Write a protein that binds this ligand. Structure first.
Ligand SMILES: Nc1nc2c(ncn2[C@@H]2O[C@H](COP(=O)(O)OP(=O)(O)OP(=O)(O)O)[C@@H](O)[C@H]2O)c(=O)[nH]1
Ligand SMILES: Nc1nc2c(ncn2[C@@H]2O[C@H](COP(=O)(O)OP(=O)(O)OP(=O)(O)O)[C@@H](O)[C@H]2O)c(=O)[nH]1
Ligand SMILES: Nc1nc2c(ncn2[C@@H]2O[C@H](COP(=O)(O)OP(=O)(O)O)[C@@H](O)[C@H]2O)c(=O)[nH]1
Ligand SMILES: Nc1nc2c(ncn2[C@@H]2O[C@H](COP(=O)(O)OP(=O)(O)O)[C@@H](O)[C@H]2O)c(=O)[nH]1
Lengths: 426, 429, 429, 426
């Protein structure tokens, strides 16, 4: 099987560097080097993310889409930056304006064809394609607009292969932009109707989870990114490993989406202990479920405790008892019968790889489909209206060839999306 | 005379590697194929030195069949007989049965038609699958399906590992197991059942170990199974052919599912303790804590048991130990059944792994049977299904895989009459 | 033929380890189980080279049963037969009988039903408990309780260690002993009694040692008991079956409690002195300072004695030594009883611990009997009870444990008619 | 079985360091090291106080509650201070004011939830829980108030498991604080109605017993603490050892409390001889009962000779004759029939472990439930009224959100508690 990553925008891009920083080491691939793999198993399934050309050069099969040179020229001028074949860099030296409209209708719409071109060169690579990974932020141009287009096109070209989306939904407390809800509401819209698996991460849900669950005092972006990339590795790549009970994107999809919206999840990693001290090793297993299922530790902003779950997928990856795994999951399902929805006898989807995260003994990625994420699109949707009402920075959109009915559309859509999700919380 | 075997699904393959291990182990045929008819009903004397297996292996992910062609035994099978579909497994019936699984079937069959020819007057195919899987439920469904037509004139005993009563794995499991039952039902001869969870109990309560690797449960079925084919197809004081089973074991066309049970499960380290009496093991057979199935005889009246013994056993000892049982009453056998005790006696005692955790006695009782008990197990597994179907849960995963509201709803109704069937054939006089 | 044994309560277990020690010691079976029918009425020949015990062990704290599975003998029992409830002991009847003790009972029984089956026509269960404890009083209460119903057709001789007359331990003791008496009374066959304190006297006055470890009193009962089962179930010139006892020993259904007494208690270091005459030991039996019970024949008329002799003894010597006694009058036997002397003669002399403190003679007299004497011992123990109950003392400890003002008050009335019973059956003509 | 110690306040904390200083050595557990145990028996029952994580790191399962950093930061910066998992430290950097009200209603009430949290993490550790050990002083904030709350919550969470309380009741002669009777009367109140076994120690009953029963001329606190910790080791931990006749918290409880108040005891150690010289070894046994049962030598302030006993528990721990033990106890019960109450035929509860205090040949902890302790709550209760009458330093309580009826309550309650106790002295 296979997949083809997609680094839309700067963020989605910045993260690319971290997702690939990791993944590679979790596959023994040095900058341009080959497979130094401490083992021999980190190779029989690599294909999922690379391509064979030389014999020591397995190049990441991702796409780097962005209308701001400097960015990709920071990712390509640093560490692992020199492993991507230049063909991968689909830049847009234009003005990468922070407008969803500027990267979806006017500026991005041009650079698109020169992207799809490659997304096809990579898809028609070889063997059988599974789906595409998509990273980006719903709070900018090259991210929400142009990346949200990249998919609307992808999903017309292969409505068969899957589409996981890793979105950095606009953090609450403080937004890293001003129109944010504009660029956001507009991209979520496109999401709820193309990709079929979305993993929403919040820069501040991370800080928290990174400053209190990792006594880490100076959580640089690199970190946040790093933590995130840690989860997306547990998801995909991982399951493309052996296991007593293994799954793969689809299983994950076909066990997690009760209703076609596409629904968004909230990823959570397992061993998340501070370096030295904490290295408690309390990782027998009840310790991992202890972790994963708590409020804090959910990369999302919202707290599960604020709304039932529809599905859950503990994708563990480290030798354990299909008994102490299958078992724990249960008590968990009974101690919290309250929030776990009922019309699904077994919400949880236990998954079990074998080999764990390179240096760790036992981990377990969590992919939750809780109704709690209602209380986020609400947020976003609110911010919109409060500012849409006055058409705040709307001239930067319309003046870019947009529509007063376009914004209406998205909000509503994504706004209805909130509605539905409640239809199950009850 | 022989009985081919098709191990389908990662599990059916893991269990396969296991049952396949125990084999050579008690036949003096190193992993290199060479030993220094009898057992020819499971091994073909290919070339002039080896003993190529007499089965096949079907998984849609390479991972699991791959491991077989790494670890000694690598030498045992023919590079050919281990079928794979590099594609995708998918923990969903539909995809495995219809959509994907389809592509491979032909090829699959070809071997069970190429391996079925080479032999000499065979008896059937011992199928190994894991009810609630993708490649195990779906695929087989049509494999056994295509068999019942290509060789209706044989035995189709499918050895299943049906859904742990509370400790299931896949989220959908029931979807996959209510579907493998309805499609295989009208195609199998006798379906043996070994409950994954109810086997753990045995590993906790009758062997003591909270460290049971899958590799163990496999050693176990890997045992109970050895008592079925292996030794039985092997000469003895009271031989029992495969046909024998289905005949003495199924009262009705429903591919009836008996339960597997073993007598001597005692842990090495106990290995020295004075051995158990012919009477004790016999009695252990009527204990709902030693039957590789969470179908505790909560009421299920037995309706036929095939007591396969092996090792040093005096026919009177049996034709007495059983007599004592026939009159325990609290073991209530069906009405319409006077005597339902097929006594199968073999010679060669069991053969325990050199150093696993199995005691190693000089006599054992692998008793299997049809018990009105499963009225439960099916019930509890059917109910599951509804709950989800009631909301369509992961339905879009099958529909989009060449299935319909039909196959589900119409396979539900199917089992419904399996809850009535297993009810009518008993509980009433 | 055999007689299972259930050692309940830490004490009943310490005494158990002891009585169990003396055993192999005089049967040439090292702690490894191996020796290089007869005694089969207490040991099952598991195969095989070993001699797995023929009893069980029940304590709610692990501490005490744990120590057994450390010190040689560790090899003697089956890892299984030593039942424990990691939970809590509680020096209170209620909790041990009702609340906690309940949970274990099933399991407990199971062994005395699993061990009771394996044998060949048994005779009963020699129960070992310590009247005034939590696990010893309560629990058993229902253990013996559940036995009297599951095997009413056998012997229930319970060997108790009833409350030291002034040197009790637990603060509540009587609560626990007026309760184990009333609940077991309507269930036992013959209850042997050995007074912890009155045994110390023997260690001070008839052996000399102010350093008597519990491990000694145990060696003692561990002796008197060996004279009961061990040797008796062992061939001899005048065998005496267990039934024999209760028959020749209880005049009335009240699970009547005789007293245990031994004759030759003399300390090693004395070991060389010229041995005692058949007449002396016989006479020593009628001395209220050698009876493992502070029930000095202060008036209690004997009503039946079972003189179990062992070693070199001429039946005339006995049927004379006893004659002399029958005419001492100051030994006044009941009226309604002409002759109440069951002479039990065994062959093999006693067998003293290699180097404890027991003399080691070539003949002994373990005479037990029902004496109107206990009219006292019960009295003095009943009175105790009242004093506290009169103020409810530690009552809240039981109530809160599934008991009521009923069980106490109604078990008090119980013994009341045990003070009248042991009074009426004697003192009157 | 198990238990989970609780170091409430500074004192209760300071003592923690001594209770654990000891206990560890009485279990061969070096700072962070493992079981160096001279024997093999000091391990089969440790669980009662530790947890398995590494394999050499059995960490004390206690709680360190305090609103004054410096304290726990003295216990954590000294000797054995680095054995407690940091998670154990439930600090309250607030102003640990010396007000019962400041650590029970206003300041402590906040830090509570973050405590209960852990008291549950430790309770749900493993196996079966027995009860919790509680150390503190009834003459301060973090001690009487906040610790007295910790229990009121504990006893609502597991009204099954027991609650031993080690209180440092306000010494007579001189009070090491001023409101003392305020912080005290208020905490005893909470005690008489939650914990079910209290062992009251008096800093001056110790001095005495430490300056005349140990010619010790400079009895530092460390010492007092050390002596105390010596008794609490004989009690618990001890009985969790084998014995001809062993008991355990409950036995101790179910043999010592005739009436539900909870009643407070007065612990006394056995061999209490000065170092060199005195090492008389007169410890055959009559020497231990000689000790234990004398007036002086009762860690309490009051003197037994001033009031009958209801129950007594000589928890001996060293190879001896169940005869010379069971016997002695008797004469003792007859030479002093006068004071020993009558409606209990056998007040004494003889207990007998096997292994003795590491370096000693024979010891025996004494836990007396004498009616004499009436003459202490009297004391306390007096001090209250004499100052309550004028509402002395009451503004520091009320001003902290308290009630004029709260103080009334406690005094009365605890005051009645004096009454009752006399109901048996007669
Ligand atoms: N006894 C036993 N049961 C197993 C073993 N492996 C898996 N199982 C059980 O069989 C079921 C798992 O099926 P899967 O491994 O998910 O799937 P599969 O049937 O191999 O086919 P796919 O879904 O397409 O991968 C679960 O109920 C497991 O508990 C094994 O080695 N031994
Ligand atoms: N002869 C003898 N008497 C003993 C022995 N151990 C204890 N006893 C006596 O039996 C009584 C003690 O019972 P406990 O040990 O307190 O309790 P238990 O009956 O084991 O059960 P629990 O109360 O639940 O622990 C006292 O009267 C002791 O004097 C022993 O080894 N030998
Ligand atoms: N986790 C994370 N968030 C990022 C990174 N870079 C920008 N963001 C977030 O992305 C949003 C801004 O969008 P941006 O990526 O600049 O848009 P674009 O570059 O015009 O497509 C803000 O909410 C930031 O917190 C990053 O490297 N990691
Ligand atoms: N034995 C003993 N008493 C102490 C110790 N520390 C303080 N105390 C006593 O505790 C009382 C003071 O309360 P304190 O512990 O300061 O209260 P808190 O710290 O505010 O909770 C005084 O009666 C002291 O004698 C100690 O380490 N050992």
């Amino acid at each position: 099987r296979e997949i083809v990553h997609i680094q839309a925008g700067q963020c989605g891009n910045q993260i690319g560097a971290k997702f690939w920083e990791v993944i590679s080491d979790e596959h023994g691939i040095d900058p341009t080097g080959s497979y130094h793999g401490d083992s021999d198993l980190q190779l029989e399934r690599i294909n999922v993310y690379y391509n064979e050309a030389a014999g020591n050069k397995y190049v990441p099969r991702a796409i780097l889409v962005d209308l701001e040179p400097g960015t990709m020229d920071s990712v390509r001028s640093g560490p692992f930056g020199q492993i991507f074949r230049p063909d991968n860099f689909v830049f847009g030296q234009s003005g990468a304006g922070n407008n969803w409209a500027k990267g979806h209708y006017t500026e991005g719409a041009e650079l698109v064809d020169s992207v799809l071109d490659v997304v096809r060169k990579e898809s028609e690579s070889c063997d059988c394609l599974q789906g595409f990974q998509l990273t980006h932020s719903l709070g900018g141009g090259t991210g929400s607009g142009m990346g949200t287009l990249l998919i609307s096109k992808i999903r017309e070209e292969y409505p068969d292969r899957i589409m996981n989306t890793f979105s950095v939904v606009p953090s609450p407390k403080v937004s890293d932009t001003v129109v944010e809800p504009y660029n956001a509401t507009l991209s979520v819209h496109q999401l709820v109707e193309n990709t079929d698996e979305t993993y929403c991460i919040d820069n501040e849900a991370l800080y928290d989870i990174c400053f209190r669950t990792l006594k880490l005092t100076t959580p640089t972006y690199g970190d946040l990114n790093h933590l995130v990339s840690a989860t997306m590795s547990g998801v995909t790549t991982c399951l493309r490993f052996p296991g007593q009970l293994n799954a793969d994107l689809r299983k994950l999809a076909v066990n997690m989406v009760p209703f076609p919206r596409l629904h968004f999840f909230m990823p959570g990693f397992a061993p998340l202990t501070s370096r030295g001290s904490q290295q408690y090793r309390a990782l027998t297993v009840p310790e991992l479920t202890q972790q994963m299922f708590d409020a804090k530790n959910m990369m999302a902003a919202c707290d599960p405790r604020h709304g039932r779950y529809l599905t859950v997928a503990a994708v563990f990856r480290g030798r354990m008892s299909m008994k102490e795994v299958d078992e724990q999951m249960l008590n968990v399902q009974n101690k919290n019968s309250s929030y776990f929805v009922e019309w699904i006898p077994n919400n949880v989807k236990t998954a079990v790889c074998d080999i764990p995260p390179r240096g760790l003994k036992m981990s377990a990625t969590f992919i939750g489909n809780s109704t709690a994420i209602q209380e986020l699109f609400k947020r976003i949707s609110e911010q919109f209206t409060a500012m849409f009402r006055r058409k705040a920075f709307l001239h930067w959109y319309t003046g870019e060839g947009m529509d007063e009915m376009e914004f209406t559309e998205a909000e509503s859509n994504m706004n209805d999306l909130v509605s539905e999700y409640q239809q199950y919380q009850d | 005379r022989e009985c081919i075997s098709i191990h389908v699904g990662q599990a059916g393959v893991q269990i396969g590697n296991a049952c396949w291990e125990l084999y050579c182990l008690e036949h003096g045929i190193q992993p290199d194929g060479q030993m220094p008819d009898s057992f020819n009903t499971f091994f073909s004397e290919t070339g002039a030195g080896k003993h190529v297996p007499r089965a096949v292996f079907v998984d849609l992910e390479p991972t699991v069949i791959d491991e077989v062609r790494t670890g000694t035994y690598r030498q045992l099978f023919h590079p050919e007989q281990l079928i794979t579909g590099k594609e995708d497994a998918a923990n969903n019936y539909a995809r495995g049965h219809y959509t994907i699984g389809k592509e491979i079937i032909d090829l699959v069959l070809d071997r069970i038609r190429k391996l079925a020819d080479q032999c000499t007057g065979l008896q059937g195919f011992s199928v190994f699958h894991s009810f609630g899987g993708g490649t195990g439920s779906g695929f087989t469904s049509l494999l056994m399906e295509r068999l019942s037509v290509d060789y209706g004139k044989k035995s189709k005993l499918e050895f299943s590992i049906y859904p742990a009563p509370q400790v299931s794995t896949a989220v959908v499991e029931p979807y996959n197991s209510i579907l493998t039952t309805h499609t295989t039902l009208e195609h199998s001869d006798c379906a043996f059942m070994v409950d994954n969870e109810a086997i753990y109990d045995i590993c906790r309560r009758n062997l003591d170990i909270e460290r049971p690797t899958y590799t163990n449960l496999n050693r176990l079925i890997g045992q109970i199974v050895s008592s079925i084919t292996a030794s039985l197809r092997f000469d003895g004081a009271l031989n029992v052919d495969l046909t024998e089973f289905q005949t003495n074991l199924v009262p009705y066309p429903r591919g009836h599912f008996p339960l597997a049970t073993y007598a001597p499960v005692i842990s090495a380290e106990k290995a020295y303790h004075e051995q158990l009496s012919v009477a004790e093991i016999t009695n252990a057979c009527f204990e709902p804590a030693n039957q590789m199935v969470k179908c505790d005889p909560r009421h299920g009246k037995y309706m036929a048991c095939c007591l396969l013994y092996r090792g040093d056993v005096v026919p009177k000892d049996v034709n007495a130990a059983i007599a004592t049982i026939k009159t325990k009453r609290t073991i209530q056998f069906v009405d319409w059944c006077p005597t339902g005790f097929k006594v199968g006696i073999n010679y060669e005692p069991p053969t325990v792994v050199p150093g696993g955790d199995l005691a190693k006695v000089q006599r054992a009782v692998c008793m299997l049977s049809n018990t009105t008990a499963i009225a439960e197990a099916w019930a509890r597994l059917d109910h599951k299904f509804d709950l989800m179907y009631a909301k369509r849960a992961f339905v879009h995963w099958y529909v989009g895989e060449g299935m319909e509201e039909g196959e589900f709803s119409e396979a539900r109704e199917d089992m419904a009459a399996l809850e009535k069937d297993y009810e009518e054939v008993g509980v009433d006089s």
